[PDB]
């Protein structure tokens, strides 16, 4: 666990974490006190914190919500609906849909919300880049459809639409009021980066959960797995480490300025770096 990437947290997380429970509550997504606790216990506006450490008060807020939003959301797979491809997508679409247009009240609660949250991020942003990150969330969406064929390589390419990492990067970049040059986002290198951030994530939660997920996954796939396990996220940071480097290079290839580049930079510390390391001291 080589993460040469310092740990952070928005000096927020106080208050933050304090009225994560307010969103949810008027949305409907918690409807009982029990409900609130399993909540509260899950920590996610914690989360929120590691991933955004760079975004304070309404901006930190949003990110709070997408977390709560990403696990109320994910609880409505872990029954019967998570088993038939055809269920599950009936709700997908009902979510999804908020790309597009307004939500008819008769709308689920979980929609309504997500609809809430997509309002707040995408508003201020330029219209390019809210149709890119909604190009995202319905990877994200159709990434459960294809999980729902519970009915390595074999294991990435579909994990990597489900974990919902792209999403929540994206968001930083809401979150910190500023844009990477659209052009270097689409980049080889930062491409590598983004997957080698997502392949990370992937395996760090497989291995934290994987006692309740053998209990009833990446390990499966004993002794020796979660070894390599290990050594490829070491090897990936390496790599990490060793494209950033790269990045100016970049810069000069797309002919970034100085506003670009300096967006470059924040992406790359603020929303990059924050969401493979926050990952990690959250984990733990």
Not at 27 to 44: C, N, T, V
């Given at each position: 666990f080589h993460i040469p990437?310092?740990?952070?947290?928005?000096?927020?997380?106080?208050?933050?974490?304090?009225?994560?429970?307010?969103?949810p509550r008027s949305?409907?997504?918690?409807?009982?006190?029990?409900?609130?606790?399993?909540?509260?216990?899950?920590?996610?506006a914690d989360l929120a914190s590691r991933?955004?450490?760079?975004?304070?008060?309404?901006?930190?807020d949003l990110g709070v919500d997408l977390m709560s939003w990403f696990f109320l959301f994910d609880d409505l797979f872990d029954g019967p609906r998570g088993e038939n491809p055809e269920d599950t997508k009936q709700l997908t679409d009902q979510v999804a849909a908020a790309l597009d247009g307004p939500l008819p009240d008769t709308a689920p609660p979980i929609a309504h919300g997500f609809a809430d949250i997509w309002r707040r991020t995408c508003e201020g942003m330029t219209p390019?880049?809210?149709?890119?990150?909604?190009?995202?969330?319905?990877?994200?969406?159709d990434g459960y459809v294809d999980e729902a064929e519970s009915r390595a390589a074999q294991y990435?390419?579909?994990?990597?639409?489900?974990?919902?990492?792209?999403?929540?990067?994206?968001?930083?970049?809401?979150?910190?009021?500023?844009?990477?040059?659209?052009?270097?986002?689409?980049?080889?290198?930062?491409s590598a980066m983004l997957?080698?951030?997502?392949?990370?994530?992937?395996?760090?939660?497989?291995?934290?959960?994987?006692?309740?997920?053998?209990?009833?996954?990446?390990?499966?796939?004993?002794?020796?797995?979660?070894?390599?396990?290990?050594?490829?996220?070491?090897?990936?940071?390496?790599?990490?480490?060793?494209?950033?480097?790269?990045?100016?290079?970049?810069?000069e290839i797309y002919q970034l300025d100085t506003a670009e580049r300096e967006a470059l930079e924040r992406y790359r510390t603020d929303a990059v770096r924050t969401v493979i390391r926050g990952s990690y001291d959250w984990h733990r």
């Open positions: 990437l310092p740990g952070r947290q928005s000096p927020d997380h106080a208050r933050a974490e304090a009225e994560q429970l307010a969103w949305l409907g997504l918690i409807r009982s006190d029990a409900a609130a606790e399993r909540h509260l216990r899950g920590g996610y991933f955004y450490p760079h975004a304070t008060g309404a901006d930190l390019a880049w809210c149709a890119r990150s909604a190009r995202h969330w319905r990877n994200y969406f990435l390419a579909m994990r990597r639409h489900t974990i919902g990492v792209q999403p929540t990067v994206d968001l930083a970049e809401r979150a910190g009021r500023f844009e990477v040059p659209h052009r270097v986002f689409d980049s080889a290198v930062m997957q080698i951030a997502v392949d990370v994530n992937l395996l760090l939660l497989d291995i934290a959960s994987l006692e309740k997920e053998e209990a009833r996954n990446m390990v499966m796939i004993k002794s020796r797995s979660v070894s390599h396990m290990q050594n490829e996220v070491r090897a990936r940071l390496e790599q990490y480490l060793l494209l950033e480097s790269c990045l100016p290079k970049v810069g």
